[PDB]
Design a protein around this motif. Structure first.
Motif, PDB file in Angstrom:
ATOM      1  N   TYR A 126       1.101  -0.885   0.024  1.00 44.04           N
ATOM      2  CA  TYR A 126      -0.063  -0.048  -0.177  1.00 44.04           C
ATOM      3  C   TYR A 126       0.946   1.227   0.127  1.00 44.04           C
ATOM      4  CZ  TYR A 126      -3.557  -3.319   1.801  1.00 44.04           C
ATOM      5  OH  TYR A 126      -4.532  -4.324   1.874  1.00 44.04           O
ATOM      6  N   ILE A 127       0.741   1.894  -1.091  1.00 45.46           N
ATOM      7  CA  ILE A 127       2.054   3.089  -1.080  1.00 45.46           C
ATOM      8  C   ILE A 127       1.035   4.322  -1.295  1.00 45.46           C
ATOM      9  CG2 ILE A 127       3.506   4.358  -2.505  1.00 45.46           C
ATOM     10  CD1 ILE A 127       4.757   1.469  -3.203  1.00 45.46           C
ATOM     11  N   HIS A 128       1.338   5.223  -0.495  1.00 46.39           N
ATOM     12  CA  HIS A 128       0.738   6.727  -0.598  1.00 46.39           C
ATOM     13  C   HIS A 128       0.622   7.356  -2.088  1.00 46.39           C
ATOM     14  CE1 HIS A 128      -0.792  10.758   0.057  1.00 46.39           C
ATOM     15  NE2 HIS A 128      -0.972  10.402   1.379  1.00 46.39           N
ATOM     16  N   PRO A 129      -0.634   7.926  -2.523  1.00 39.95           N
ATOM     17  CA  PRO A 129      -0.604   8.155  -3.919  1.00 39.95           C
ATOM     18  C   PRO A 129       0.079   9.713  -4.096  1.00 39.95           C
ATOM     19  CG  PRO A 129      -2.943   7.316  -3.209  1.00 39.95           C
ATOM     20  CD  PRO A 129      -1.820   7.535  -1.875  1.00 39.95           C
ATOM     21  N   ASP A 130       0.282  10.400  -2.978  1.00 40.77           N
ATOM     22  CA  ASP A 130       0.700  11.651  -3.077  1.00 40.77           C
ATOM     23  C   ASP A 130       2.241  11.751  -2.581  1.00 40.77           C
ATOM     24  OD1 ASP A 130      -1.790  12.874  -4.542  1.00 40.77           O
ATOM     25  OD2 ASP A 130      -2.539  12.392  -2.343  1.00 40.77           O
ATOM     26  N   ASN A 131       2.284  11.086  -1.754  1.00 46.84           N
ATOM     27  CA  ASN A 131       3.638  10.858  -0.736  1.00 46.84           C
ATOM     28  C   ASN A 131       4.091   9.566  -0.666  1.00 46.84           C
ATOM     29  OD1 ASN A 131       3.615  14.097  -0.064  1.00 46.84           O
ATOM     30  ND2 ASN A 131       1.911  13.318   1.139  1.00 46.84           N
ATOM     31  N   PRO A 132       4.730   8.749  -1.755  1.00 43.66           N
ATOM     32  CA  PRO A 132       5.195   7.575  -1.849  1.00 43.66           C
ATOM     33  C   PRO A 132       6.217   7.441  -0.652  1.00 43.66           C
ATOM     34  CG  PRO A 132       4.769   8.368  -4.055  1.00 43.66           C
ATOM     35  CD  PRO A 132       5.030   9.530  -3.203  1.00 43.66           C
ATOM     36  N   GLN A 133       6.044   6.275  -0.043  1.00 47.69           N
ATOM     37  CA  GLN A 133       6.985   5.742   1.017  1.00 47.69           C
ATOM     38  C   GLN A 133       8.382   5.298   0.198  1.00 47.69           C
ATOM     39  OE1 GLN A 133       3.916   4.849   0.574  1.00 47.69           O
ATOM     40  NE2 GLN A 133       3.234   3.741   2.672  1.00 47.69           N
ATOM     41  N   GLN A 134       9.509   6.073   0.372  1.00 49.63           N
ATOM     42  CA  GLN A 134      10.757   5.511  -0.395  1.00 49.63           C
ATOM     43  C   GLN A 134      11.169   3.996  -0.208  1.00 49.63           C
ATOM     44  OE1 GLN A 134      12.082   8.028  -2.540  1.00 49.63           O
ATOM     45  NE2 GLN A 134      12.775   6.048  -3.400  1.00 49.63           N
ATOM     46  N   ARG A 135      10.960   3.682   1.059  1.00 42.51           N
ATOM     47  CA  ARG A 135      11.529   2.080   1.284  1.00 42.51           C
ATOM     48  C   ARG A 135      10.713   1.230   0.328  1.00 42.51           C
ATOM     49  NH1 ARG A 135      12.212  -2.020   5.013  1.00 42.51           N
ATOM     50  NH2 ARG A 135      10.347  -3.502   5.087  1.00 42.51           N
ATOM     51  N   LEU A 136       9.290   1.492   0.295  1.00 38.73           N
ATOM     52  CA  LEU A 136       8.491   0.604  -0.550  1.00 38.73           C
ATOM     53  C   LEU A 136       8.663   0.633  -1.928  1.00 38.73           C
ATOM     54  CD1 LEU A 136       5.026   0.633   1.462  1.00 38.73           C
ATOM     55  CD2 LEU A 136       6.932  -0.940   1.688  1.00 38.73           C
ATOM     56  N   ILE A 137       8.837   2.021  -2.344  1.00 36.34           N
ATOM     57  CA  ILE A 137       9.350   2.315  -3.808  1.00 36.34           C
ATOM     58  C   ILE A 137      10.646   1.508  -4.025  1.00 36.34           C
ATOM     59  CG2 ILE A 137      10.317   4.271  -5.251  1.00 36.34           C
ATOM     60  CD1 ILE A 137       7.404   4.352  -5.038  1.00 36.34           C
ATOM     61  N   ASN A 138      11.628   1.659  -3.169  1.00 32.44           N
ATOM     62  CA  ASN A 138      12.689   0.819  -3.289  1.00 32.44           C
ATOM     63  C   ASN A 138      12.541  -0.706  -3.611  1.00 32.44           C
ATOM     64  OD1 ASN A 138      14.148   3.361  -3.271  1.00 32.44           O
ATOM     65  ND2 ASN A 138      14.850   3.140  -1.639  1.00 32.44           N
ATOM     66  N   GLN A 139      11.869  -1.032  -2.794  1.00 34.42           N
ATOM     67  CA  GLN A 139      11.553  -2.559  -2.791  1.00 34.42           C
ATOM     68  C   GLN A 139      10.926  -3.102  -4.094  1.00 34.42           C
ATOM     69  OE1 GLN A 139       9.714  -4.620   0.759  1.00 34.42           O
ATOM     70  NE2 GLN A 139      10.327  -2.679   2.143  1.00 34.42           N
ATOM     71  N   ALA A 140       9.916  -2.089  -4.472  1.00 32.26           N
ATOM     72  CA  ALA A 140       9.239  -2.550  -5.636  1.00 32.26           C
ATOM     73  C   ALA A 140      10.242  -2.467  -6.854  1.00 32.26           C
ATOM     74  CB  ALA A 140       8.461  -1.517  -6.018  1.00 32.26           C
TER      75      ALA A 140
END
Length: 206
Positions: free
Chosen positions: A6-20
């Motif tokens: 679950y990633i915030h639409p406006d302020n994406p959590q960097q950690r999950l972004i990197n994991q993806a």
């Protein structure tokens, strides 16, 4: 089976972004949100991944793959853009559109449409997609996530999960999106051709 972020639409959590992105670098196939419905994405040079996406999308013969790019600059690296092409795309970016252009040498030949050696270029306008690309450092091979046979895009993370939990490596919940796909404009010829009228206004190309 597929992970589910679950990633915030406006302020994406960097950690999950990197994991993806890591999942993508490892050759995985992910489902991520765009300003125009959900999309399937994988690393450009991963053949197996390409194969998987192709089968989930059931890409019609002659239909182009898509290169999700950060901006026009990056797009001009993977496709041939002359002054007129640039002029037409300049004010109709980012979001709402997929532009069919001739791919450059930077594009794996297997991704180009055999006939015309073309490919779809697309710059998403949403934070999550933009953050994914920034982290990746290059375009993401993609296709819109269309419910087979249908003309509309998947827009519900749960519904997507029920349908593809065992077919993709990650599903990014980026909110409940729209269902209208991008407007597809072919720019390879002297006269822009409306391949598909989606969310993007076709007037600029008439």
């Amino acid at each position: 089976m597929s992970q589910f972020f679950y990633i915030h639409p406006d302020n994406p959590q960097q950690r999950l972004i990197n994991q993806a992105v890591e999942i993508v670098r490892k050759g995985g196939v992910i489902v991520y949100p765009t300003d125009s419905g959900y999309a399937l994405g994988c690393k450009i040079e991963d053949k197996n991944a390409m194969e998987r996406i192709c089968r989930i999308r059931q890409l019609p013969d002659g239909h182009n793959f898509t290169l999700m790019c950060r901006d026009l600059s990056e797009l001009s690296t993977y496709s041939f853009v002359d002054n007129v092409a640039f002029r037409l795309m300049k004010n109709n970016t980012p979001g709402n559109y997929t532009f069919i252009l001739k791919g450059t040498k930077e594009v794996p030949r297997r991704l180009l449409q055999e006939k015309r050696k073309t490919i779809g270029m697309r710059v998403p306008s949403n934070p999550i997609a933009q953050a994914l690309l920034e982290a990746l450092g290059e375009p993401m091979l993609s296709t819109s996530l269309m419910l087979p046979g249908s003309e509309f895009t998947e827009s519900d993370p749960e519904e997507i999960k029920d349908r593809l939990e065992k077919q993709v490596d990650l599903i990014i919940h980026g909110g409940y999106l729209g269902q209208k796909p991008t407007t597809v404009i072919d720019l390879t010829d002297d006269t822009p051709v409306v391949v598909r009228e989606g969310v993007g206004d076709v007037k600029p190309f008439l």
